[PDB]
Homo-oligomer: A and B are copies of this chain.
Amino acid sequence: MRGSAHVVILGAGTGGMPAAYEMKEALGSGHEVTLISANDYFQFVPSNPWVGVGWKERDDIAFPIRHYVERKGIHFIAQSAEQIDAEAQNITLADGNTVHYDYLMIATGPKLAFENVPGSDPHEGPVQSICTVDHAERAFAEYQALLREPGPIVIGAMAGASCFGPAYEYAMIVASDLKKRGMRDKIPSFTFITSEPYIGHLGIQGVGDSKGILTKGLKEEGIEAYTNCKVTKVEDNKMYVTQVDEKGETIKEMVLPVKFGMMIPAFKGVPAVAGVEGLCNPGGFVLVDEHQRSKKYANIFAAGIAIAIPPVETTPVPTGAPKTGYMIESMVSAAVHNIKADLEGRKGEQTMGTWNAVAFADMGDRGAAFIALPQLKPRKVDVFAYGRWVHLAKVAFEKYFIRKMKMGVSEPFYEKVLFKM
């Protein structure tokens, strides 16, 4: 309302949860902040692969949101938004109730586009997913069914995927867990299928010696790897795969039996956001400027996986570049700053800064990680790391981020200054 603007944050994930706290800290008691989310709990997404192999449980990586945001004066609605009317500035919830906003910050993450590959939905066949804790639990249940009745394994990433690290991580920890259980020798075949033009491309044209290291890692585990692949369908417990050459021409088709499978799907924008006229590209991603502001609606901002970022290359099989946590938090920080600036008679000038990708993977006792910036080469930083210390750093960061999601954030967010003293 006038003089007391209502800011709604849609989606309580890696971007949206911090966005809610930061928005309320920034605006104070004179304004209303409402966080709306499909789930009543927060989950630490990067730990889902471990849930998928039974190395972690839901309770380790997830917690109920309400009390933590409410104690900060933030309203919480645990309902999915089904429609957004950008003209009237009304959000229609799954229960049919309506929420009006003065500013909207979209942080809705990805729609997991299983529809791209008929039969690939985790509920339709043997190809599972570890992108959410619900799905990771389902993946682990199927993994146990595999242990009871061993059969072919296929892990990888679909055409159009932008999130490749977790596929490699999952393959490695499944292989590891099999060995632990003395079951590895009972698997007839273990295959890695990816849309990447080469192993370790990771949607970022490689980082450090990711190609050499991941290539050798898969080989060492007896995992046969295929690149430039797209899955045309999953049917009768078989994955139908087409492999192309540099020019997109078929060099082979394969039919792979699958007892246990996990393929990272392509991401699209969620339906309620994609459905807003003029807001998004054909993929459903919000078209925003450098200030995280929608190009169509001046009072809609967006951050996280939900925003559109232009491609920098065109791979033989479509692939996308990942949108990772540090860049996401930079988007959130900028959006919050610029909304506040708007509420104070200014055009905020803050941007997300330089494009970058960062990621951790934990194989158990040791981890891998990378940092790449900016997007195109030659880069200013292009590094891949491996070792026990990376495992320890992942453990530490998870513990930290979860505590911060409970205690609240406000500051820029980062402890780079704390560990450098």
Residues of chain A having any CB pair with chain B under 8 Å: 208-209, 351-354, 356, 373, 377-383, 385-389, 392-393, 419-421
Contact = CB atoms under 8 A, between A and B. Distances in A.
A364 to B, nearest CB: 15
B382 A387 contact: yes
A234 B338 CA distance: 68
Contact of A393 (B354, B380, B392, B419): B380
A354 B208 contact: no
A382 B352 CA distance: 27
Copies of this protein in the complex: 2
B382 A389 contact: yes
5 contacts: A209-B386, A352-B421, A373-B420, A377-B389, A378-B389
A354 B389 contact: no
A242 to B, nearest CB: 33
A380 B389 CA distance: 7
Contacts of A351: 421
Contacts of A383: 383, 385
A392 B421 contact: no
A355 to B, nearest CB: 9
B392 A378 contact: yes
Contact of A420 (B353, B385, B387, B392): B353
Contact of A385 (B352, B354, B356, B382): B382
Contacts of A386: 208-209
A385 B419 contact: no
Nearest to A392: B378
A420 B388 contact: no
A388 B378 contact: yes
Given A353-B421, A381-B389, 6 more contacts: A208-B386, A208-B387, A209-B386, A353-B420, A379-B389, A380-B389
A208 B385 contact: yes
A372 to B, nearest CB: 10
